[PDB]
Amino acid sequence: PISKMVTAHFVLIHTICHGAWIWHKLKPALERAGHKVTALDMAASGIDPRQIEQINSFDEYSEPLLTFLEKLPQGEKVIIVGESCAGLNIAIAADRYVDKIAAGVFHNSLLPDTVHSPSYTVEKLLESFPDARDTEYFTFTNITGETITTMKLGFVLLRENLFTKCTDGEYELAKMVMRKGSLFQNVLAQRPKFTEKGYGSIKKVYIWTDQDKIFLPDFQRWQIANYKPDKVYQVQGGDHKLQLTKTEEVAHILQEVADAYA
Amino acid sequence: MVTAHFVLIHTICHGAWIWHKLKPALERAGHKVTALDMAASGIDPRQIEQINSFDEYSEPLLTFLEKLPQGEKVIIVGESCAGLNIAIAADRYVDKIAAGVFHNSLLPDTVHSPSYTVEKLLESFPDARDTEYFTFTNITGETITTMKLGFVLLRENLFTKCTDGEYELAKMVMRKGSLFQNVLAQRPKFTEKGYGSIKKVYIWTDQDKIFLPDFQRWQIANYKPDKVYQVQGGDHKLQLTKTEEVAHILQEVADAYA
Amino acid sequence: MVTAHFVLIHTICHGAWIWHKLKPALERAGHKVTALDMAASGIDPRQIEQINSFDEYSEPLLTFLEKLPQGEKVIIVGESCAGLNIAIAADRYVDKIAAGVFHNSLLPDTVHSPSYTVEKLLESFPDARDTEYFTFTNITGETITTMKLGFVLLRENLFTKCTDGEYELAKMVMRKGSLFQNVLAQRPKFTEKGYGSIKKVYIWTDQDKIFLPDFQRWQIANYKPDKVYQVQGGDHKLQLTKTEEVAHILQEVADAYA
Amino acid sequence: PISKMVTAHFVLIHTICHGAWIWHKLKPALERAGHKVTALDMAASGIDPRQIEQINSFDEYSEPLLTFLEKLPQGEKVIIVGESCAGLNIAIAADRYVDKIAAGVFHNSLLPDTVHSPSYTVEKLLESFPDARDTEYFTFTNITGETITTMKLGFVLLRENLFTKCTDGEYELAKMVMRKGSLFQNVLAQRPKFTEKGYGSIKKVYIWTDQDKIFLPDFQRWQIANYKPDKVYQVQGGDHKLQLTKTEEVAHILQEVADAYA
């Protein structure tokens, strides 16, 4: 009757162990459409110079995004797209910058809520997927004496579970740039719950595929049932890295989020 | 058809990632492929200000080679400035090297100092366009110049013909780097027994927009390779724009030198 | 008389060498003594420009403590700025620490930021005489100030009463160092459960010519120790000028806290 | 009839694994006498920032001394005092700066000659003392493919053989600052012989004690017999570190060298 088409500023957030590089196919697809796209490496990820053992919480890990948001011009708002564990970065960020956020998009992602502890979807995730195959774990003691478990994701888990359907060039790349990462689960467990006026108020779009071999369908559906998103988009096929296996489809869904909220 | 163990070496500011298309292609032919991050490159944790020479920058390669089991030999493939990593490596581990392959690369010699081809490259291409430079003093007091490669330079000169996904990946993981030109200017020349003796295969395209055809042609005249393969078209990053063509030449190098 | 395991921690720019008289004295009483070089100090191979905070500088202590066998506790003895290494350590490993001993040292608290006693020290002693300063940008962009301690300052203020052999040794192995003042200014305060809970013994002399008696007295009033021992005379380096007096106080600390 | 007393500029050179710090008692004793004293750390020794694996020859190891000598004012000459393996640093230096050297003093030191290979007294030394007790060895490959053996001197060998009679404060200090070191024997073996006009022409004073428990009396006497020094001074007692156990005696001998040659 009236048709709307909106250009938007997406801030793309990788999951633990990965970096901005995972968005190297979706960032151009989005810019072809005329959007502005920022893909940030979080602390100790991608080519960020910090080492994970110098990071003490998922909040500290989130520093690049929060600094970025501190610096957005007055009146500018972004759509934050986070994959896998980056839903926690979107919740940390929305409790600090709710007015700079047009919508949070969870892409095969943790969907934190305000009712339970910050670590709650992490517990549920680990319950749904308790074997990380060839992943190696390590520990360090943080600034207040908490022991932090880090992981070096194994190559079979990478091949089969996270990058199932990706090309060999994309699977080799992941192996060439993957870093250690941590869920910081135990400090998230001690963390104040996400707020209703910050995080609880942002618009939330949930993109997922039932072919995801690490954030499995029963888990994903549990999260959707646990904290109803404003909108759900299920992509058929692909794998956990839909920004690699369904790049264009994800860019078309993201155009729709920009039209509704940006 | 011989299967070989190839060790792929990226150029300054880049990392093992630049080989993410060529490593699976080689492996489809049954080759073993090792792709290393040099010091302060790709996801190596060291920062460029702690590296004091091009030989210290080469450490991942020299450690690798130090540990290769007895009787094993590798073909080292080096792009752009990595021709200097092949020559440093060949002088220390000549018996472990079946051949060196220069992929749009510097081709050092034994007659001039180690910085000679770096001098000539800068003469052929003196404007790095939007590249930024920085300096630090190394542990011995020498001033080292680092660069952060400009994105117009990346787009138009290095990744000229690359896809947008590839160029974008380049911007996302590019690190600072250094020619260590002045320490190379002070370094002993590469030896005739080490580097001078290895087999040398030169791969290039005249469509390369940073290692320009007359510099490449001067290099070949200055120190004639055992073989020169020229790929038509593509750009400076032939392992991305002509991946199967370089995998095929590299099969010819495994056949010839094992 | 209790034998204890003492971990001795030097101040910025110095190294484990400053304890070369006190380590044998303690061992004559059957104590176990570990004396560590902090990052970029004594013969540690790292350079100060690669260290980005006082917590990274503390790494040798935190690794040590990370590996102490279960059920073992240590008395950490820290001189001058090493009071900050004790507080960082006590927050991460409170159960491994029988007591902290401040030897003419900064005595951080929990109520103000980690840089508060550094601010007050500089206020009490703002002229470092012939000390030189340098800066570098750390990995996060903060400007770090380093110093090379001047020899008149070493002779007259730090090693005032020391023998000529000792002062000369100091000049021969002194390294650059940093207060990382501004990163400490940004650091979370020391916790009441970690650092706030440990036993704290303060050793000093009013003849100290860099940590002057009114700053030391302000520290004790600002955060009253469990015990304060005052040694008459000597100088700032009591582990060199009053070695047996500090070994004797430290026997009293092993007796009291094990 | 006429009595002479001379003030001189001594350049003190430590042995491999040690640093300028070993001279911390003799440097003040000499300055009490009015001499000028330089004590240098050689490459990868004392607090020199270079690591031994970046050093490729005893010549490269000798860089601090040669740079120093390049910089001496015209007409200035020094007496170089070298302990244990530092006789090779004195020979490397005298072939480059013979006119800046008033005399070489070998203090329980290797006494290189011009007739045999540079590595020859190193072979003889290792033959006289073949067991380095708890010393650990390591290897790296140098800039031309030679394998270099390095050593971390063991603590018993330090206690009993090198620092036999030193105080506990001096023995603990050595342990606190000792570094890896290398004889570079195999590259010395390939090295051109020291020259007769450089090294063969400098005055050479040999200080030693027969109580030295690592450069043993039969070895020392072999060296004295092998290449007759211009003057020999035998200190009674002490140990291998005579600059620590006989500091004043060594300073009085060194006053005599300054009167004869400086």
PDB file of C-alpha atoms in Angstrom, chain A residues 11-16 18-30 32 37 39-40 81-86 105-109 161-167 170 173-174 178 207-209 212 214 235-254, chain B residues 165 168 172:
ATOM      1  CA  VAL A  11      27.599  -4.514  13.602  1.00  0.00           C
ATOM      2  CA  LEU A  12      28.583  -8.175  13.101  1.00  0.00           C
ATOM      3  CA  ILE A  13      29.906 -10.120  16.164  1.00  0.00           C
ATOM      4  CA  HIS A  14      31.678 -13.473  15.824  1.00  0.00           C
ATOM      5  CA  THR A  15      31.555 -16.251  18.458  1.00  0.00           C
ATOM      6  CA  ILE A  16      34.366 -17.246  20.910  1.00  0.00           C
ATOM      7  CA  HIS A  18      36.575 -17.013  15.860  1.00  0.00           C
ATOM      8  CA  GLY A  19      37.026 -13.346  14.651  1.00  0.00           C
ATOM      9  CA  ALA A  20      35.562 -10.707  12.231  1.00  0.00           C
ATOM     10  CA  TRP A  21      36.897 -12.977   9.422  1.00  0.00           C
ATOM     11  CA  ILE A  22      33.854 -15.294   9.700  1.00  0.00           C
ATOM     12  CA  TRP A  23      31.792 -12.430   8.204  1.00  0.00           C
ATOM     13  CA  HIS A  24      34.002 -12.024   5.124  1.00  0.00           C
ATOM     14  CA  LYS A  25      31.260 -13.246   2.773  1.00  0.00           C
ATOM     15  CA  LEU A  26      28.217 -11.625   4.462  1.00  0.00           C
ATOM     16  CA  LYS A  27      29.815  -8.117   4.888  1.00  0.00           C
ATOM     17  CA  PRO A  28      30.130  -7.582   1.058  1.00  0.00           C
ATOM     18  CA  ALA A  29      26.684  -9.096   0.381  1.00  0.00           C
ATOM     19  CA  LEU A  30      25.245  -6.540   2.811  1.00  0.00           C
ATOM     20  CA  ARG A  32      26.001  -4.632  -2.142  1.00  0.00           C
ATOM     21  CA  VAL A  37      28.753  -2.935   8.027  1.00  0.00           C
ATOM     22  CA  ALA A  39      32.714  -6.518  11.782  1.00  0.00           C
ATOM     23  CA  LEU A  40      34.736  -6.333  15.018  1.00  0.00           C
ATOM     24  CA  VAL A  81      24.149  -9.533  14.503  1.00  0.00           C
ATOM     25  CA  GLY A  82      25.827 -12.155  16.758  1.00  0.00           C
ATOM     26  CA  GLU A  83      26.489 -15.769  15.912  1.00  0.00           C
ATOM     27  CA  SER A  84      26.641 -18.744  18.383  1.00  0.00           C
ATOM     28  CA  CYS A  85      27.909 -17.401  21.812  1.00  0.00           C
ATOM     29  CA  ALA A  86      27.615 -13.786  20.650  1.00  0.00           C
ATOM     30  CA  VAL A 105      19.782 -10.536  15.597  1.00  0.00           C
ATOM     31  CA  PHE A 106      20.770 -13.982  17.022  1.00  0.00           C
ATOM     32  CA  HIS A 107      22.135 -16.170  14.202  1.00  0.00           C
ATOM     33  CA  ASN A 108      22.326 -19.841  15.456  1.00  0.00           C
ATOM     34  CA  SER A 109      22.975 -18.042  18.724  1.00  0.00           C
ATOM     35  CA  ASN A 161      29.848 -29.757  13.657  1.00  0.00           C
ATOM     36  CA  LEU A 162      30.490 -26.070  13.041  1.00  0.00           C
ATOM     37  CA  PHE A 163      31.505 -26.018   9.354  1.00  0.00           C
ATOM     38  CA  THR A 164      29.578 -29.140   8.177  1.00  0.00           C
ATOM     39  CA  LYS A 165      28.605 -27.937   4.727  1.00  0.00           C
ATOM     40  CA  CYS A 166      31.155 -25.141   4.196  1.00  0.00           C
ATOM     41  CA  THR A 167      33.623 -25.359   1.362  1.00  0.00           C
ATOM     42  CA  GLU A 170      36.297 -21.988   4.180  1.00  0.00           C
ATOM     43  CA  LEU A 173      40.604 -20.756   6.527  1.00  0.00           C
ATOM     44  CA  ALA A 174      38.908 -21.411   9.909  1.00  0.00           C
ATOM     45  CA  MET A 178      41.020 -19.953  14.882  1.00  0.00           C
ATOM     46  CA  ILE A 207      17.679 -16.811  12.590  1.00  0.00           C
ATOM     47  CA  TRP A 208      18.494 -20.562  12.717  1.00  0.00           C
ATOM     48  CA  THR A 209      18.548 -23.780  10.649  1.00  0.00           C
ATOM     49  CA  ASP A 212      22.939 -26.994  12.566  1.00  0.00           C
ATOM     50  CA  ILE A 214      26.353 -28.015  17.121  1.00  0.00           C
ATOM     51  CA  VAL A 235      16.650 -21.042   6.889  1.00  0.00           C
ATOM     52  CA  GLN A 236      16.351 -24.433   5.248  1.00  0.00           C
ATOM     53  CA  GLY A 237      19.563 -26.395   4.817  1.00  0.00           C
ATOM     54  CA  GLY A 238      23.040 -24.982   5.179  1.00  0.00           C
ATOM     55  CA  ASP A 239      24.844 -25.556   8.478  1.00  0.00           C
ATOM     56  CA  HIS A 240      25.871 -23.715  11.691  1.00  0.00           C
ATOM     57  CA  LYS A 241      27.829 -21.134   9.623  1.00  0.00           C
ATOM     58  CA  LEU A 242      24.846 -19.793   7.661  1.00  0.00           C
ATOM     59  CA  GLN A 243      26.792 -16.574   6.887  1.00  0.00           C
ATOM     60  CA  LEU A 244      29.015 -18.863   4.791  1.00  0.00           C
ATOM     61  CA  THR A 245      26.533 -21.524   3.546  1.00  0.00           C
ATOM     62  CA  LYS A 246      23.479 -19.227   3.067  1.00  0.00           C
ATOM     63  CA  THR A 247      25.146 -15.783   2.722  1.00  0.00           C
ATOM     64  CA  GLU A 248      22.589 -14.282   0.369  1.00  0.00           C
ATOM     65  CA  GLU A 249      19.595 -15.722   2.220  1.00  0.00           C
ATOM     66  CA  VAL A 250      20.936 -14.265   5.450  1.00  0.00           C
ATOM     67  CA  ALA A 251      21.489 -10.896   3.736  1.00  0.00           C
ATOM     68  CA  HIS A 252      17.873 -10.983   2.507  1.00  0.00           C
ATOM     69  CA  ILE A 253      16.545 -11.747   5.976  1.00  0.00           C
ATOM     70  CA  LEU A 254      18.724  -8.944   7.326  1.00  0.00           C
TER      71      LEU A 254
ATOM     72  CA  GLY B 165      34.942 -12.172  -0.230  1.00  0.00           C
ATOM     73  CA  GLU B 168      37.296  -8.483   2.587  1.00  0.00           C
ATOM     74  CA  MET B 172      39.954  -8.481   8.322  1.00  0.00           C
TER      75      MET B 172
END
